[PDB]
Amino acid sequence: MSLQMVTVGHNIALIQPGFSLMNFDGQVFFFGQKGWPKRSCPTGVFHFDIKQNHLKLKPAIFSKDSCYLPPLRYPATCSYKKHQYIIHGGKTPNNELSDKIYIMSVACKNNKKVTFRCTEKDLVGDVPEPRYGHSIDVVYSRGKSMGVLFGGRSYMPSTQRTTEKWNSVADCLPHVFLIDFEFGCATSYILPELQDGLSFHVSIARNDTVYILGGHSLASNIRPANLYRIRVDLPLGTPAVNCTVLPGGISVSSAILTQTNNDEFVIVGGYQLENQKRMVCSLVSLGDNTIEISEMETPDWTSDIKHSKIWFGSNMGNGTIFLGIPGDNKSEAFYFYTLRC
DNA sequence: GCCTGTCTTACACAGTGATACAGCCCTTAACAAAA
């Protein structure tokens, strides 16, 4: 794992905590810019290309049949296999939470210049309340595909919300949501094993299962060291969901996850306590019914990283993470690194 | 047939202690109006 500093072009201000990166056919893209999109890039979607440790953000265009989704911070994202990206929830530049779900796909790649399709999917049934900091992944069971959504935070319900605490947030009830994108429907499942709310956790999806790692629970103000396996079977039109607690769970919120090889993932970064950062790294190796979490060699962090109180980042896709920390003195607002695996 | 920060001074005015100017109630006698 080699750490490398990155320089940024004129529009560095766009990058903020809560941003996301999506990878299409090796090409990386950036979404969730700070502020509302400007004339320079009306979509809020950017080619995110790092050449010789220099990062350029170049505006990307939408197809004629696209939505223009608002920039979203801490939305739930996953990748769907004809490869597309699912974005659900998040905070908008006006601090509202969206209940909408957007789908990003490549509409046209002409002479290495990508046009995107952003389509909004209506959701009916048990729609999950607007959220941020929650997970969504795709499971495959019995030749059928289903979305699994869990966790996050939201504002108080319209009945109890008051202007003195107008921005107060609470964890959502820990109901797993099965989401059929084909029909646009959502079903909620209460499980006894998920008693507490959880947000900013990590989710790993393999076949018919999603594992839930770390995260932070507001009510207890704990980052629990639990690992949850959630299995989904889809026999015809009657889905079934079952959860199992598995000991050996890491305790981490806001960690970043990257795939280094099939059935092996690396977990880097995050927070172990409010004032402490998780400097260690984990390797997760997947079996068809087993999951293994092993400590790995901690990278050669610089002193700036070691002493930073906050860091934020995203997975670039090619086993490489894009990281960031703030700096004061004279000078830059943010300093960015790329950690390879 | 551009966008959009950064940079640079123009510009007005704030607000200092000093200073110039106007307005203050009188000061001589006498009538006298209200009470």
Curated annotation (Swiss-Prot):
Tissue spec. comment: Maturing lymphoid cells.
Presence of the UniProt keyword Zinc-finger in the record: yes
Location of the protein in the cell: Nucleus
Reported effect, residue 304 to N: Does not affect the endonuclease activity of the RAG complex
One CC-aspect GO term: nucleus
Keyword vocabulary terms for this entry: Chromatin regulator, DNA recombination, Metal-binding, Nucleus, Zinc, Zinc-finger
Species this protein is from: Mus musculus (Mouse)
Major location (coarse): nucleus
Full protein stretch here: 1 to 350 of 527
Effect annotated for changing residue 274 to Q: Does not affect the endonuclease activity of the RAG complex
Subunit structure: Component of the RAG complex composed of core components RAG1 and RAG2, and associated component HMGB1 or HMGB2.
Taxon lineage: Eukaryota, Metazoa, Chordata, Craniata, Vertebrata
Coiled coil feature spans: none
Known function: Core component of the RAG complex, a multiprotein complex that mediates the DNA cleavage phase during V(D)J recombination. V(D)J recombination assembles a diverse repertoire of immunoglobulin and T-cell receptor genes in developing B and T-lymphocytes through rearrangement of different V (variable), in some cases D (diversity), and J (joining) gene segments.
Gene: Rag2
Free-text domain note: The atypical PHD-type zinc finger recognizes and binds histone H3 trimethylated on 'Lys-4' (H3K4me3).
Family according to the record: Belongs to the RAG2 family.
Deletion consequences: Mice are viable but fail to produce mature B or T-lymphocytes. Very immature lymphoid cells are present in primary lymphoid organs. These cells do not rearrange their immunoglobulin or T-cell receptor loci. Double knockout with TREX1 does not show a visible phenotype.
GO biological process: B cell differentiation; B cell homeostatic proliferation; B cell lineage commitment; defense response to bacterium; DN2 thymocyte differentiation; DNA recombination; mature B cell differentiation involved in immune response; negative regulation of T cell differentiation in thymus
GO molecular-function terms, A-Z: chromatin binding; DNA binding; histone H3K4me3 reader activity; phosphatidylinositol binding; phosphatidylinositol-3,4,5-trisphosphate binding; phosphatidylinositol-3,4-bisphosphate binding; phosphatidylinositol-3,5-bisphosphate binding; phosphatidylinositol-4,5-bisphosphate binding
Protein name as it appears in the record: V(D)J recombination-activating protein 2
